[PDB]
Design an enzyme around this catalytic site. Sequence first.
Site, PDB file in Angstrom:
ATOM      1  N   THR A  73      -5.146  -5.381 -33.234  1.00  0.00           N
ATOM      2  CA  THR A  73      -5.649  -4.914 -31.952  1.00  0.00           C
ATOM      3  C   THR A  73      -6.311  -6.059 -31.187  1.00  0.00           C
ATOM      4  O   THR A  73      -6.583  -7.136 -31.725  1.00  0.00           O
ATOM      5  CB  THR A  73      -6.643  -3.766 -32.141  1.00  0.00           C
ATOM      6  OG1 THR A  73      -7.827  -4.253 -32.785  1.00  0.00           O
ATOM      7  CG2 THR A  73      -6.031  -2.657 -32.988  1.00  0.00           C
ATOM      8  N   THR A  74      -6.578  -5.810 -29.909  1.00  0.00           N
ATOM      9  CA  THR A  74      -7.151  -6.820 -29.033  1.00  0.00           C
ATOM     10  C   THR A  74      -8.670  -6.837 -29.150  1.00  0.00           C
ATOM     11  O   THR A  74      -9.319  -5.787 -29.171  1.00  0.00           O
ATOM     12  CB  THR A  74      -6.744  -6.573 -27.580  1.00  0.00           C
ATOM     13  OG1 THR A  74      -5.324  -6.396 -27.505  1.00  0.00           O
ATOM     14  CG2 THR A  74      -7.143  -7.758 -26.713  1.00  0.00           C
TER      15      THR A  74
END
Lengths: 244, 249, 239, 195, 239, 242, 111, 244, 232
Positions: free
Chosen positions: A31-32
């Site tokens: 994920t970011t």
Amino acid sequence: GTGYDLSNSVFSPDGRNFQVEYAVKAVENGTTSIGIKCNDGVVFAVEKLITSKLLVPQKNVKIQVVDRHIGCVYSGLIPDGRHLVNRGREEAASFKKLYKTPIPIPAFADRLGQYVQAHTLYNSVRPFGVSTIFGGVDKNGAHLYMLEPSGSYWGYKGAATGKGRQSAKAELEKLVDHHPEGLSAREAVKQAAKIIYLAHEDNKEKDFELEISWCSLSETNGLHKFVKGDLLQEAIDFAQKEIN
Amino acid sequence: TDRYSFSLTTFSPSGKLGQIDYALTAVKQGVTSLGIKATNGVVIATEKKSSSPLAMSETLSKVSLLTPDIGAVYSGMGPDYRVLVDKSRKVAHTSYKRIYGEYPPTKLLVSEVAKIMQEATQSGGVRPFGVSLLIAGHDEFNGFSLYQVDPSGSYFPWKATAIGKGSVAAKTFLEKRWNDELELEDAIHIALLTLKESVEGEFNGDTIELAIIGDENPDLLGYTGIPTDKGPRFRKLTSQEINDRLEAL
Amino acid sequence: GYDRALSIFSPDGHIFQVEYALEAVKRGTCAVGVKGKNCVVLGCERRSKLQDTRITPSKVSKIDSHVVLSFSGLNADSRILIEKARVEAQSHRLTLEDPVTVEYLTRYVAGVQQRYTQSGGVRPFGVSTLIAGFDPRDDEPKLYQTEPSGIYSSWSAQTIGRNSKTVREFLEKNYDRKEPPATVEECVKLTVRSLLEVVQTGAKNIEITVVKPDSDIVALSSEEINQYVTQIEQEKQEQ
Amino acid sequence: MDIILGIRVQDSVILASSKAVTRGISVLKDSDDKTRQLSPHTLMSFAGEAGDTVQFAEYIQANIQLYSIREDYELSPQAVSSFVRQELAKSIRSRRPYQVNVLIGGYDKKKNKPELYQIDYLGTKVELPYGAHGYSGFYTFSLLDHHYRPDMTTEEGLDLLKLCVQELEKRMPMDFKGVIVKIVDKDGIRQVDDF
Amino acid sequence: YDRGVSTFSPEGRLFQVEYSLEAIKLGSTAIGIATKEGVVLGVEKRATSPLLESDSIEKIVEIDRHIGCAMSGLTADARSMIEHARTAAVTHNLYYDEDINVESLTQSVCDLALRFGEERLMSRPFGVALLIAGHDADDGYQLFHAEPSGTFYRYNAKAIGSGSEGAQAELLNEWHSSLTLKEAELLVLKILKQVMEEKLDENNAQLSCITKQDGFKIYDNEKTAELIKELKEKEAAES
Amino acid sequence: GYDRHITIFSPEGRLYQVEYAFKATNQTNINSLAVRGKDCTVVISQKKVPDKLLDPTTVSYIFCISRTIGMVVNGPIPDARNAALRAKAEAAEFRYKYGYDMPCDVLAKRMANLSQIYTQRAYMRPLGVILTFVSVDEELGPSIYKTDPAGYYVGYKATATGPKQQEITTNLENHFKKSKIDHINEESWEKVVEFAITHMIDALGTEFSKNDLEVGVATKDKFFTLSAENIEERLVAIAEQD
Amino acid sequence: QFNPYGDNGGTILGIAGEDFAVLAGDTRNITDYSINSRYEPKVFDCGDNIVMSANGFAADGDALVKRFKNSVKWYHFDHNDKKLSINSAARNIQHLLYGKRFFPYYVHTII
Amino acid sequence: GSRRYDSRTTIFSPEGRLYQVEYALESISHAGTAIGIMASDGIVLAAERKVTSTLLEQDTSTEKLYKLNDKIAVAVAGLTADAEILINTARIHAQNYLKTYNEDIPVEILVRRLSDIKQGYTQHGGLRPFGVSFIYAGYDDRYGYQLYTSNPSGNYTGWKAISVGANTSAAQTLLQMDYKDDMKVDDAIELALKTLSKTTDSSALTYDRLEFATIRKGDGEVYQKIFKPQEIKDILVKTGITKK
Amino acid sequence: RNNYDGDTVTFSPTGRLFQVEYALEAIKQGSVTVGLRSNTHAVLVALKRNADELSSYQKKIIKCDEHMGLSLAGLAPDARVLSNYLRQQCNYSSLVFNRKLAVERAGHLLCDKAQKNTQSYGGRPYGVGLLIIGYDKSGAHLLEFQPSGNVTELYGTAIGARSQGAKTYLERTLDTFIKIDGNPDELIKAGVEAISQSLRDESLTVDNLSIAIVGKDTPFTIYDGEAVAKYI
């Protein structure tokens, strides 16, 4: 020859360690997570994928704290990130026990970098599958660092890693170019919310929960605290306005 | 964790030890270094091949004093020779001087270095040394002596021998020019003549490194007062002396 | 330091190192043991010259005054097993104030071999063993066999080593459980015949050791074995 | 307060060991055998601290028997005495030293000679024509110095040991409840029944 | 040798565990039946030669006075397990002045099965399966199957070893909750005779029982032969 | 094929892992030269900040090992920081045990011996870095000593390391052949910095701004690194030079 | 020199009946001639219908009671919540005490 | 990890042999031939030097025959360094036995100790075996004169006349042809020299290409003589292999 | 793929750890177990699996402390090891701090324990997945632990074979079971219905069903046998 990517810490004929690059590939699939260094402090933000609504919201915290002034977020293999955070907590505890003062951010960065680099030195250990954005406030001001699975770390005005890393980095470059004077703490929090909302476009299949923390000398007295309550909703509203 | 607790040097089906032969091959590709034993001293010479002329030639010592009466030169991989010289200097004290009050003889120090190298050819997770050593020494009860130590851990006493690339050709020269009535200056002259063919670049005191185990140097003791303690027998020839002996060839 | 699992399981449920140690046993010298009514006899094959029989070690080794051990396979590992067995016999004498039983010693050697099959960084013993003797206050003979796998079992008569299948079949055909060899001579004769069925070289390559109760161990000289082989070859002249 | 005497008499070695084991003001046993047969031709009598004596004696016995089984060869009395002296000299500089004194009597079959060695708990070994451990020596040595002859017979040695035991029973302030006497010669080790 | 001993299969299994199970499948048959009057354990004395004294085939051992065990497969590997079980039982008796529960003993034995790898552990998992029968005051009579996988099950009846598969089928058809002790003995003998490659007699089959009254007892050849004769009479009285 | 994975001898008597570590030293595509003056030593390295999000003050391949020894690394920054930490620890231990500051050549030899250990031991990989230590030794004057992943160490009158190492080496060789001396006959260290930067400009054929270079100066009992403003002032003085 | 032990006074008493038992203790904790506490209980319920009191050095008694309660907890953990019989608890406490045979708990125990 | 490079030196072959042991035997088969002969009044060891040259100092040279104590010597075949390691351990064990029992160590005990060391190297540890075969020539007051042989496998056997190294087949054939029990030490010297001259790979058998040793009784004690080059030349011109 | 499933120390070219995935697959081949929670209670339902009619049904729920317990799915010995670690950590908390170990910290410690095996050469990942229920100062908690190390706090979930049906059932019934406060029996019946939604050709019996409940004024209690009849 061939087979240079089968064991860790094996130099390939082109001068590369392919296991580190495979760990980087594992990081890119995560994920970011972003970090923004403002004038008086730093802000960290992360996107949490809601695979099902059975996940309890506001739980499953991804942003971790080291000492009382260091904030750390990571993209990749979350357990490896927790391992690295525990190692950093041990380093900070020893530093405080010996030198009294809380550990400076560059010192903590070098400790984590030496740990990861040592983990890329032997075929009996696997490289870390995380990219870590950390930082905080010390006697020399605010500091933000990003550390790769290779053990290479650097200081950044803005950092981002994950799926939406490209978009997030572009947005951070825009923030660096448009505001040479510097952003404030709450402004950086709202901008981090916006950047996370924009980076989520690379993983639009699932919904996401935004998680923000900040360590600022003016707003939090130099301590790392989670952006909660009214400010979190304000940043979410700013992001939702920046979208539509 | 060091999980390499197994031998990296094993017998091949033909009986050969691969790593031993490969270290010997690395030795054969090294710069030529020779040694000649005379009746009043021993000489060891080698070529001081410098990569870049910007490099300091004095900071590249291929001949190293082990004891005031024992020196050594090599052919092969420099760093292995350096760590072997350090280990040899340490074992000369921890295994002899600190037990008998005197420096070791040539044969004993050579055997200790050979034991180190043999351990390096059988211990776990280690490659053999990529060097062959020529150790020239003098002790009171065995006189002068010259030994060759191979990566396999074997050592041989030599009246004169060379190791390296053109070593074979050099050895032929020695076989034609060696006699049991040689003097130290005659041995140095033969060493210079033998090394002149093994080199192709400049042949001067800055490209050659030569040392001798000859008479004692009381002027090199650093102190005067004990007549029993003589000077060191090892002496590295200066570039001026090498050029002065080269001008008369 | 070195702890790599050398003895592991195969997809067909086999431990290949134990089977290869058994194969090494099959290449070793022959060694047979026969139980009498009041004695045990261990015969061994001395392979094929210019060997000093005075100083060369014999296959039959004394573990204690009452128990002996012969082997088949790699002699070098057999020495280690014999030394461990002797040390454990002395330790058991020290701690229990009683000499070891044949079964206890057999079980100890078998446990050592099983440990070597299950421990990391070590290979099994290329040795199969025949342990023969009498309990400290028992006249009943005891003959046990142990394998590299760690299995130990009692036997009225059993052989190991090269061509041991032929000797084992000859014993199965000539050994009667209802009437074991009554005298020592009958047991020694059966042993030397079972050996000559495979050695085909003569008494020069046959060693015989007879153990009898109350610690009476006697190794037959070449002359006694020559007497036995001549008697049986004369009995063989019948056709 | 243990009587350990030994005397070498041309053809054999005679070892005498007191029979009394006393713990406090109570004679617990009056028939104790303070010897261990290390080999068919080598015996060892012992005296010292409680427990240490038997432990050391049986340990040495197990080691000697292990050597005899491994090598199929009986160690000479000199080598056995040297091994015992080495063990006792390692004990003193250990954590708990063995407080045992030993008298080793053995007939060397190679030299066809009787030998008697005296070793203390410190590792002091001496080869003696006659030896004694403890206060018993203070009465026996001089007595032996007057009556011992190197050309004595085993029976003359028994008479001399009887004289020593009589002097000890007269002048010693403790009742050691008699002595067990054993003879070591070329024919092995035997015990005198009534002494 | 190309993977590690602690390596998972693409199907989610340990290679060495399944290989050890395959090895146990080649072992002798061991059957157990738990009733309300006791638990019966029967094993096959597989003799490789008529010279082997079948009395020395110890595949049924006593863990404690109230717990017995039968082994199938590489029975040499079971020696350390049985020793650990006996020491655990006596140590529980020492610490708590009571008998260790059968489930607790089985769990303590299974704690060693997966303790292998490359703190120095074993090189390979065990190559022997165990049937642990016992009686405790909490759960009455119990029968447990213990694999080298560290996992153990409780069985009202369980068969392991060669031909155990079909044997289990028969164990499903003829077992009921109201089955008695003698019925369990006869059923074990019948299934053993079915799954054996030899004629069932007291020399190739061994029986043992765990009862609350008399503890763990291994039946002598007399009782075994009597029960075999009774089973033959019962099977001859059918259609 | 396994002879090219661990530090063991190939059939040709070579250690391919060492050669591949040498190859990895050039992964950063940064060149660095080192020169000696009358009483100082200057190192110049390329400062490449490709990302705009980077803090330029943290991008550094020069390390202050002690008060007297500096070290410039050619290679990846993980191994660079590893070698830097080890060198600082070794200098501290030397000063503690022997009561005087660790000489430059001694630290170079220590690092080269550790490299030889990594070359002969198979459990650890060689550090793909080339370390150039510089100091003003109290007994040797200005000193430059370089060590490589193979375990070699040697001193230099001047040196260069990087992709364009041969060109800078030839330029320095030509200048020293012309001047017929083994150093830079200048009293002030600023002019020596200017000389080094100028010759790097001549060798690489590309101009540099104040944010493209890293300068490390070692004088008697003091090693420091120039800021961007001092680098820019030296560049202005070089532009004034005809 | 540091004395590892201390005296905290107090007195406990156990009496066994026909179908019951009683364990009582004074709630007074003292040190030398001062009153540390007027109510500090020293008789504890350890579960499985077992009461325990180790009177003497209060630190060693508290440590012993805590170790025994942890012992009954792990006894339930390792034996499917089997009830700890009084004899089993007695022997377990004997082993807990003899574990410090050469550094004992300076307490007199009654269960 | 590291198992990829482990050769597994102490494993069995499907036939029942140790790979490294057989290969070390093959290695020793290329070493200089050594011959021991036990006569009625002495023992003789003779060996051929493989490393032979005109510039090789033969006076201070020792590559085939070594002393263990005052009554035992060894002829080596194979790796000289492994041989010297084992000889050092053997000397230390002999002196340990001497300190313990105040008697000279019997020959068979030292041979069994060294052979057990070589065996243990072939069962555990994962190290290559010692590529060395030993011929032990000794005397003690229990078995008299003794000749033993040991190989890297750890086995040791007793002999009257034996050979190790290269061309063992022809040498053993010649020995079995020309050996007699009642022969003396000089006859054994003659036989060893003839066997070495007939089984050598070189042109002629010269003094500078051989090492020689004799353990004999001549006083009342046994003397161990390592032959000097001049004594070797003299015994060669006496036997007739060379002339002067 | 082929040359990347030898150990946990090797990354794949795409950045995968195939041994961890093989442990996950070992879990997927394990018997199903569901967990759910409200604001006052937390329930674990376990479908115990047997080998044959003569076999027992392997217990799947393990108690770690009076306020915390877990149910397993996968390798039983690995679950025993992790449960022993959790018991020791709860005991350490209670003894050293007089503080009941929170469920979040227990999940973090099991995450660390699992990660310590997926990075060192030698060994293997754990072949079990855990569902941990607890009640602490923060209320009721349900955690899902995978051998990758990721531990996630959920209202409800299910692990094992065919667990997706139960997961979708809890997804649909979230607004219902999150509000079952004060009545543990309704939460238990909801969990039983959830585990029934994942029974392909199977049926709940009195020997195959296991229940575990912990909540406010309710210590962690296990119900096996006749006790579960009321919920079948």
